[PDB]
Amino acid sequence: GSLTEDGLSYKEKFVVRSYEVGSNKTATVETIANLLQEVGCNHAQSVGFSTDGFATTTTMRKLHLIWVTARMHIEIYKYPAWGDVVEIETWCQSEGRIGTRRDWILKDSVTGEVTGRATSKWVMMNQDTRRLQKVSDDVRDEYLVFCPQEPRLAFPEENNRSLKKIPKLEDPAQYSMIGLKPRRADLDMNQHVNNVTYIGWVLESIPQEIVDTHELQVITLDYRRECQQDDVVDSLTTTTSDSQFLHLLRLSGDGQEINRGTTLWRKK
Amino acid sequence: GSLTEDGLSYKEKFVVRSYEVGSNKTATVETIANLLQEVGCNHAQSVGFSTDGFATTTTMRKLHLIWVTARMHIEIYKYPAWGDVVEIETWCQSEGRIGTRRDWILKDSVTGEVTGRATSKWVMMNQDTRRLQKVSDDVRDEYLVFCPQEPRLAFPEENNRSLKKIPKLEDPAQYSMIGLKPRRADLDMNQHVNNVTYIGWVLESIPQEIVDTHELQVITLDYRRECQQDDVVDSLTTTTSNDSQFLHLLRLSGDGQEINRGTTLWRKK
Numbered sequence: 001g002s003l004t005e006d007g008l009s010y011k012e013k014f015v016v017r018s019y020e021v022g023s024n025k026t027a028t029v030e031t032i033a034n035l036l037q038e039v040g041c042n043h044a045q046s047v048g049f050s051t052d053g054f055a056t057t058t059t060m061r062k063l064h065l066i067w068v069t070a071r072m073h074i075e076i077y078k079y080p081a082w083g084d085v086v087e088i089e090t091w092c093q094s095e096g097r098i099g100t101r102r103d104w105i106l107k108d109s110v111t112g113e114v115t116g117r118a119t120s121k122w123v124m125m126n127q128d129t130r131r132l133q134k135v136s137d138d139v140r141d142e143y144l145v146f147c148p149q150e151p152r153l154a155f156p157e158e159n160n161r162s163l164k165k166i167p168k169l170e171d172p173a174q175y176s177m178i179g180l181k182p183r184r185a186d187l188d189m190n191q192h193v194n195n196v197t198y199i200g201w202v203l204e205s206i207p208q209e210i211v212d213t214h215e216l217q218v219i220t221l222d223y224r225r226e227c228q229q230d231d232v233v234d235s236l237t238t239t240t241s242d243s244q245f246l247h248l249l250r251l252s253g254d255g256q257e258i259n260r261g262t263t264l265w266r267k268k
Numbered sequence: 269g270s271l272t273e274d275g276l277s278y279k280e281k282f283v284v285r286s287y288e289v290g291s292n293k294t295a296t297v298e299t300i301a302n303l304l305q306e307v308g309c310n311h312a313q314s315v316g317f318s319t320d321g322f323a324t325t326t327t328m329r330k331l332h333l334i335w336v337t338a339r340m341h342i343e344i345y346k347y348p349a350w351g352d353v354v355e356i357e358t359w360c361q362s363e364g365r366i367g368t369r370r371d372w373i374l375k376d377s378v379t380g381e382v383t384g385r386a387t388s389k390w391v392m393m394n395q396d397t398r399r400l401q402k403v404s405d406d407v408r409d410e411y412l413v414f415c416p417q418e419p420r421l422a423f424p425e426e427n428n429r430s431l432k433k434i435p436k437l438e439d440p441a442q443y444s445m446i447g448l449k450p451r452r453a454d455l456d457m458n459q460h461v462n463n464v465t466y467i468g469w470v471l472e473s474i475p476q477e478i479v480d481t482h483e484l485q486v487i488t489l490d491y492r493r494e495c496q497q498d499d500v501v502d503s504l505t506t507t508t509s510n511d512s513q514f515l516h517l518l519r520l521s522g523d524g525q526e527i528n529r530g531t532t533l534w535r536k537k
């Protein structure tokens with residue numbers, strides 16, 4: 001991969017692997033999400049930021065401050081087939097004191113057609129206390145020089161799906177998968193549960209009949225609290241409708257919320 | 269990737285990804301295993317075989333016959349770091365009617381030094397009845413033309429670790445991880461649990477203190493029965509031993525039906 005000519009975005013090509021595809025012989029949404037994280041990490045490295053998923057500076061490191069994902073929104077038009085080359089372009093943009101956005105565009109390398117797009121919202125937090133804090137001016141200036149100044153949005157439309165508020169699923173859920181636990185492969189280099197694991201957990205409570213007859217078109221997922229290495233999770237889903245679902249991930253015992261989201265599926 | 273000049277082996281380079289590394293910022297053994305499977309699949313594709321993990325011909329497909337892994341043995345000297353390039357060479361060799369072997373050599377692209385090696389044993393089986401059958405001469409001839417004729421072994425030594433018999437762990441196990449279940453990401457394109465998932469499940473019952481102070485050098489794993497999509501597994505481990513050795517067993521959570529047995533060898537960091 002490499003930064004683009006203006007140095008304000010980063011592009012990388014990937015060849016879809018055999019173990020990366022589902023029963024449709026095309027990349028799963030979790031493979032797509034891993035590739036998004038990979039290109040994001042390579043963009044941070046290319047300009048000198050930390051590569052641990054927290055995109056920190058020496059200044060943030062001294063203050064024990066980290067960037068954390070608050071929301072992921074992915075829309076896929078065509079899932080790449082095994083052996084296909086997908087090119088992904090990513091960029092970062094500040095949204096004031098509130099937080100920062102990282103966007104992605106996925107393209108078919110051969111045709112040049114846009115096959116998917118994604119957006120994410122990030123917030124700054126002290127890694128020990130977990131307390132959120134507004135971005136300081138001295139740390140904002142550190143990363144602004146790597147972002148476009150004019151608005152550049154993967155989802156330009158005012159009040160589009162990526163910004164919709166997500167309600168809390170009410171019991172009883174129509175479907176559930178309980179007792180989900182992360183294993184070592186689900187952890188990152190810092191021993192935290194990888195953000196993509198929660199996408200897989202959300203999807204575990206979708207009936208197999210939906211997965212066999214439909215394709216996932218949109219997934220929006222809010223991240224409220226981390227699942228620790230020794231926690232156990234329950235994945236809940238209710239049909240709200242194309243097929244649409246409302247999702248909730250909570251701790252198996254006390255029912256503490258860790259994630260909420262919605263999915264939209266298209267009949268094959 | 270590509271077949272080599274003599275067309276009897278296949279090589280491919282991989283750049284280690286951020287999500288592919290563990291706490292040591294080097295590739296996990298499961299990432300290594302996925303890369304082994306990937307280069308194996310690319311070698312089958314390069315010469316016209318099926319790419320579903322069963323390496324079948326049109327002849328085998330008409331008979332509902334498949335190749336299945338009976339044993340995996342991996343030895344790693346140095347785990348590649350994030351961003352490093354690892355080159356992997358693989359080849360296949362028949363071992364008579366018994367079964368066939370697929371071997372791998374991993375190298376550091378920059379230095380050319382051998383950083384790891386692996387071997388696997390495969391057997392032919394009817395995919396519906398799960399009954400094993402000896403390889404026929406007409407099936408055998410189909411793939412022999414893609415294998416070296418002279419012996420080429422990643423583990424040449426006559427009485428080496430890759431061929432050692434593995435005993436059955438006796439209860440009580442020293443350590444256990446209970447209620448492990450596969451999710452959709454653990455399945456392949458045919459909806460079978462991926463062979464690498466069982467490696468992760470074996471390792472779940474190793475105490476975190478061993479993982480933090482030691483590095484995995486060798487893993488040998490026998491595959492006896494497959495875990496179905498709706499099955500639940502128990503991972504059991506007992507220390508058998510500067511080095512640490514363990515005996516492992518994976519069994520169904522309910523009746524205790526064996527699915528895998530293996531051994532691991534760890535070296536202090």
Ligand SMILES: Cc1occc1C(=O)NCc1ccco1
Nearest residue numbers: 043044055067092100102122146
């Ligand atoms: C998504 C995000 O939220 C807060 C910071 C970032 C980020 O990615 N920063 C590193 C970087 C590398 C190139 C541009 O920015």
Ligand SMILES: Cc1occc1C(=O)NCc1ccco1
Nearest residue numbers: 311312323335360368370390414
């Ligand atoms: C491991 C194995 O056991 C039985 C067959 C095979 C195999 O890989 N065959 C396909 C192939 C591609 C190049 C050479 O052979």
